[PDB]
């Protein structure tokens, strides 16, 4: 397991975020003030469209950011 802490990875058109333990984060995350949802299987950010999460529809920008909240 490679050290890779408290940062994003942009890989093959997908977006991942790594916590302090060098693992890809899943589910809802606030990163630098912005909201993201990382899919529980792939760890990829919900991005570039509308997604239903727990019965609520949200929009995520291409950068993965949830439109307001």
């Amino acid at each position: 397991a490679i050290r890779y802490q408290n940062r994003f990875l942009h890989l093959l058109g997908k977006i991942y975020y790594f916590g302090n333990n060098s693992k890809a984060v899943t589910g809802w995350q606030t990163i630098n003030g912005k909201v993201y949802y990382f899919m529980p299987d792939t760890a990829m950010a919900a991005a570039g469209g509308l997604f239903e999460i727990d019965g609520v529809i949200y929009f995520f920008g291409v950068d993965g950011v949830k439109a307001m909240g």
Partner: nanobody, 126 residues
């Protein structure tokens, strides 16, 4: 909603020192010290990541201020040496919940913090 309480503020002469304490009901991923002078915005001063203890500082306090944690006592500390008039401010500590993260370049920006304490006053006289 994490509770934070600061202490150790005071009046001191320029060149002197203070040590602030921040008691927290829990630590997030990071603990920060901010300060706010009259009429200015809050500015982040120092931050520590609670896993491993990496420390970050704003350029104006490097070599003067030191941030540290005691996880046993759920307390974070700011040792403030070689104080100057421009260090006068209300000092407040902050943290965030479990799914809150900051990258190195943002760990001293106020918008990566969710929970704030009350403030302890620091006044540096000439």
């Amino acid at each position: 909603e994490v509770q934070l309480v600061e202490s150790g503020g005071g009046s001191v002469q320029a060149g002197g020192s203070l040590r602030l304490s921040c008691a927290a009901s829990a630590f997030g991923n990071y603990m920060g010290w901010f300060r706010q002078a009259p009429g200015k915005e809050r500015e982040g001063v120092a931050a520590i990541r609670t896993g491993g203890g990496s420390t970050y500082y704003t350029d104006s306090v490097k070599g003067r201020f030191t941030i540290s944690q005691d996880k046993a006592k759920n307390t974070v500390y700011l040792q403030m040496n070689s104080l100057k008039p421009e260090d006068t401010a209300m000092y407040v500590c902050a943290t965030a919940g479990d799914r809150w993260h900051a990258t190195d370049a943002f760990i001293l920006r106020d918008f990566v913090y969710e929970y704030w304490g009350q403030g302890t006053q620091v006044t540096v006289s000439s």
